[PDB]
Amino acid sequence: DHEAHIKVLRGEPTPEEMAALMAVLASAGGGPAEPVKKERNMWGHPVDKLRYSVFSWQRVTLLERTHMRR
Amino acid sequence: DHEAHIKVLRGEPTPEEMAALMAVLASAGGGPAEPVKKERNMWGHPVDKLRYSVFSWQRVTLLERTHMRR
């Protein structure tokens, strides 16, 4: 029972106004309802387009890190 | 004087014979014998043709080191 509920802090609507309000709010709600897991596609990632010095620490902290983050 | 010289361990040549021997040896000398003129050219070096895992330790111990040795 530990979830955030909608609160009507002020006002005492009757069942009809409550129903209208909830219907409108549900209609307003949207966006990604139950989206699939976002597909990984590292092809042509910006990090791969950079010039790295042969001894650059960013070869570890930026390039390898980006390729390995999962 | 700490130069390594030629030694005639056995035998006792006369000056003419020593002259002949030394002339033949000097002619047989190895010429330039690998001069210091060698120049660095890392274009198309084999290490750059290898597939490296994104986290390969050989990126440090083989690739980076080969590119950095002087």
The oligomeric state of the chains shown is part of a larger assembly
Count helical runs of chain A: 2
Number of E-state strands of chain A: 0
What is the share of helical residues of chain A?
25-40%
Structural overview:
The structure is cut from a larger assembly and holds two copies of chain A (70 residues). By secondary structure, chain A is mostly helical. The first copy, chain A, is 36% helix and 0% strand. Chain A contains two helices and no strands. Chain A has helices at 15-28, 58-68. The first copy, chain A, is rod-shaped. The two termini of chain A are 32 Å apart. It is classed as ligase. Keywords: Carboxylase, transferase, lipid synthesis, mycolic acid synthesis, ligase. Structure of the long chain acyl-CoA carboxylase complex from Mycobacterium smegmatis with ATP, bicarbonate, and propionyl-CoA.
Descriptive terms for the model:
part of a larger assembly; 2 chains; 70 residues; mainly alpha; 2 helices; Acetyl-/propionyl-coenzyme A carboxylase AccE5 (chains A, B); propionyl-CoA carboxylase activity (chains A, B); acetyl-CoA carboxylase activity (chains A, B); ligase
Topology:
The structure is cut from a larger assembly and holds 2 copies of chain A (70 residues).
Chain A: H1 15-28, H2 58-68
GO molecular function (chains A, B): acetyl-CoA carboxylase activity; propionyl-CoA carboxylase activity
Protein name (chains A, B): Acetyl-/propionyl-coenzyme A carboxylase AccE5
Organism (chains A, B): Mycolicibacterium smegmatis (strain ATCC 700084 / mc(2)155)
